[PDB]
């Protein structure tokens, strides 16, 4: 049976290939995770079909209804067999689905326009001139909503009660806000996405500070799935052979424009 | 029933407290892993005895007989119900034991005496005057034995055939050799341990270059054990509450000497 693979559109993990309205199947796509789905598949020995996630979110449980949206949801309600994507391993998610070991490391970092008077997270908390928010429906938002640290609680208290909303719907949207906002908007996003943007034209963004925390992206399968075992091992193999780090070079740096 | 926790002596994960003879049971020990295991045991609601693995090793497999030694063996062969140490998640191990998600990140690094004319793993591979070795029966040794990267196979080639042996039985021995060799021995060891040593008197060693790869420390449990699960959620919990980041700063940095 062809494995159905859910994933989300996020450069440079998965990206529409210049000509698509063309080729077809999995060929439509390219990017770090597309490349990873290929070797994963070969080593586990299965055929697969990439499909992009509907609502285009990563996945939170909606407090109201208690329904899972996003890629996590696609797994939880049986619409897919596996998620290969920038999907953060977190306690709440590990409760409803199974995670492989991490294939990539990352942490919550700050993005600012170059020339912004900001050096750290402590720095953002101590001020009002510069607004900051996070993506909606992701790890980073929850990280704040649930944190017990001095700086991170205040930061949250601000973000949840600010108007207009400091939250964006997509990473692209949050990046464009930084640029358009003339250095009066910082964006809290994960490190890997920061470092990637920092390397793209027009080169007006930059990542400042040390990460606020430490975590990783795992590949996801339905809780109690049989793939969960092979897939995991596939990840370990590919890591020790050097693949994951060779691929990070290919999509992050060997492509640099800065 | 009391959970037998196996572990190894390795600064600053597990250490004999300055009252080595005067105290008893778990009290004898202090350190990063001693604190971690305490919170693990609190959050999973069990009691435990810490014992130190006998052959003071981490765990490799005899190619002769195929028997496991060190902590991996203590799990494999029933002598212990869990291993709480700086034990590295690798692929051969993950075949015979279960690993929690990472609780700490690390990579392979070079330690040299200050002043040594080395900058990278490649610089080492390009000469013979300076000898370089690694801990025996560890993740690192296996990394080289199994690496297909040009620079690492040539390193492995030199190490596997060097005399006197470039290998060492304890990280402590490896360090001693670096110091006493007047900069003619370098030691390939894990970034974590390196960062720690760097900040202790006599302050004569120094981490160099970047990390030769990425990986992590996991809590291991016998394949298909009941603790395996509880233990994992426990790690995930503690990582979010920040404890792991707080713990690390206590043992590595609030402990600095240079
Ligand atoms: N250094 S890390 O925690 O980001 C990491 C851990 C593992 C990887 C990859 C990374 Cl980057 N894959 C192989 N095994 S692991 O310990 O889960
Ligand atoms: N970035 S990492 O691979 O070193 C890492 C991964 C995890 C942590 C902590 C770290 Cl530093 N704990 C929570 N879940 S995780 O993905 O296993
Ligand atoms: N990548 C995150 C969401 C985006 C963010 O919060 O930065 C996740 O997998 O949940
Ligand atoms: N942490 C390693 C041992 C130390 C090393 O290999 O440098 C292991 O789990 O085997
Ligand atoms: Zn298009
Ligand atoms: Zn606690």
- In this structure, are B15 and B65 located in the same domain? yes
- In this structure, are B229 and B247 located in the same domain? yes
Q: Is residue A204 exposed (0-12), middle (13-18) or buried (19+ Cβ within 10 Å)?
A: middle
List, in sequence order, every residue forming a beta bridge with B97; answer none if it has no partner.
Answer: B222
Q: How far apart are alpha carbons A120 and A110 in whole angstroms?
A: 8
- In this structure, are A112 and A162 located in the same domain? yes
- In this structure, are A233 and A192 located in the same domain? no
Closest CA relative to residue A223, chosen from A78, A104, A38: A78
Which residues does chain B have within 8 Å of residue A213's beta carbon, measured at their own beta carbons? 242, 245
Query: Which residue has 């509907």 as its token pair?
Result: A54
Q: What are phi and psi of B144, to 5 degrees?
A: -70, -45
Assigned token pair, A103? 């294939």
Name, in order, each residue with C-beta under 8 angstroms of B127's C-beta and a sequence gap of 6 or more: none
Query: Which residue has 């609030």 as its token pair?
Result: B254
Nearest Cα residue to atom 9 of ligand 3: A87
Residue B189 belongs to domain with CATH number: 3.40.190.10
The resolution in Å comes to 2.9
- In this structure, are B50 and B65 located in the same domain? yes
Q: Cβ of A158: how many Cβ atoms within 10 Å?
A: 18
- Which of A32, A87, A173, A187 for mutating ligand 3's site (highest number of atoms within 8 Å of CB)? A87
3-state secondary structure of A176: helix
> Does the beta-carbon distance from A94 to B143 stay under 8 Å?
no
Closest CA relative to residue B216, chosen from A207, A222, A35, A218: A218
Q: How far apart are alpha carbons A144 and A160 in whole angstroms?
A: 10
Is A86 within 8 Å of A192 (Cβ atoms)?
yes
Q: Which domain holds residue B184?
A: 107-215
- In this structure, are B127 and B247 located in the same domain? no
- In this structure, are A100 and A228 located in the same domain? yes
- In this structure, are A73 and A51 located in the same domain? yes
Q: Cβ of B216: how many Cβ atoms within 10 Å?
A: 20
Q: What are phi and psi of B208, to 5 degrees?
A: -135, 145
- Smallest CA–CA distance, residue B147 to chain A, in Å, is 7
Buried residues in B59-97 as b, exposed as e (16+ CB within 10 A): bbbeeeeeebbbbbbbbbeeebbbbbbbbbbbbbbbebb
- Smallest CA–CA distance, residue A24 to chain B, in Å, is 35
Instruction: State which approach was used to obtain the coordinates.
Output: X-ray
Distances (CA, A) of A3 to A40, A49, A55, A103: 12, 6, 21, 20
DSSP string, chain B: --EEEEE--BTTTBEE-S-TTT--GGGGEESHHHHHHHHHHHHTT--EEEEE-TT-----B-TTT--B-HHHHHHHTTS-SEE-SS-B--TTGGGTEEEPSPSEEE-EEEEEETT-S--SHHHHHT-SSSEEEEBTTSHHHHHHHH--SHHHHHHHHHHHT-SS---BSSHHHHHHHHHHTTTSEEEEEEHHHHHHHHTSTT--EEEES--S--EEE--EEETT-SHHHHHHHHHHHHHHHTHHHHHHHHHHTTT---
Q: How far apart are alpha carbons B184 and A217 in whole angstroms?
A: 40
CA of B74 to the centre of ligand 5 (A): 56
Domain total in chain B: 2
Is B178 within 8 Å of B113 (Cβ atoms)?
yes
- In this structure, are B164 and B91 located in the same domain? no
Handedness of CA B29, B32, B34, B38 (dihedral sign): positive
Q: What is the CA radius of gyration of chain B?
A: 18
Ligand lying closest to the C-alpha of residue B238? 6
Q: Where are the alpha helices (DSSP H) in A15-167?
A: 32-44, 70-76, 91-94, 121-125, 139-145, 150-160
Q: How far apart are alpha carbons B79 and B217 in whole angstroms?
A: 21
> Does the beta-carbon distance from A214 to B240 stay under 8 Å?
no
Closest CA relative to residue B155, chosen from B167, B172, B137: B167
List, in sequence order, every residue forming a beta bridge with B113; answer none if it has no partner.
Answer: B205
- In this structure, are B191 and B223 located in the same domain? no
- In this structure, are A94 and A167 located in the same domain? no
């Amino acid at each position: 049976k062809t494995v159905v693979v859910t994933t989300i559109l996020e450069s440079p993990y998965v990206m529409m290939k210049k000509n698509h309205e063309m080729l077809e199947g999995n060929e439509r796509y390219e990017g770090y995770c597309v490349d990873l789905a290929a070797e994963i598949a070969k080593h586990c020995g299965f055929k697969y079909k990439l499909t992009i996630v509907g609502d285009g979110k990563y996945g939170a449980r909606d407090a109201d209804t208690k329904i899972w949206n996003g890629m996590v949801g696609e797994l939880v309600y049986g619409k897919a067999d596996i998620a290969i994507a920038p999907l953060t391993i977190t306690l709440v998610r590990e409760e409803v689905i199974d995670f492989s070991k991490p294939f990539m490391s990352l942490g919550i970092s700050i993005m600012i326009k170059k020339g912004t008077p900001i050096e750290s997270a402590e720095d953002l908390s101590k001020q009002t001139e510069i607004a900051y928010g996070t993506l909606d429906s992701g790890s980073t938002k929850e990280f704040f909503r649930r944190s017990k640290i001095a700086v991170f609680d205040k930061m949250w208290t601000y973000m949840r009660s600010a108007e207009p909303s400091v939250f964006v719907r997509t990473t692209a949207e949050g990046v464009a806000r930084v640029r358009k906002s003339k250095g009066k908007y910082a964006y809290l996003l994960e490190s890997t996405m920061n470092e990637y943007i920092e390397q793209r034209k027009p080169c007006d963004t930059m990542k400042v500070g040390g990460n606020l925390d430490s975590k990783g992206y795992g590949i996801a399968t339905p809780k109690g799935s049989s793939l969960g075992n092979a897939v995991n091992l596939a990840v370990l193999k590919l890591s020790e052979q050097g693949l994951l780090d060779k691929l990070k070079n290919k999509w992050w740096y060997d492509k640099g424009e800065c």
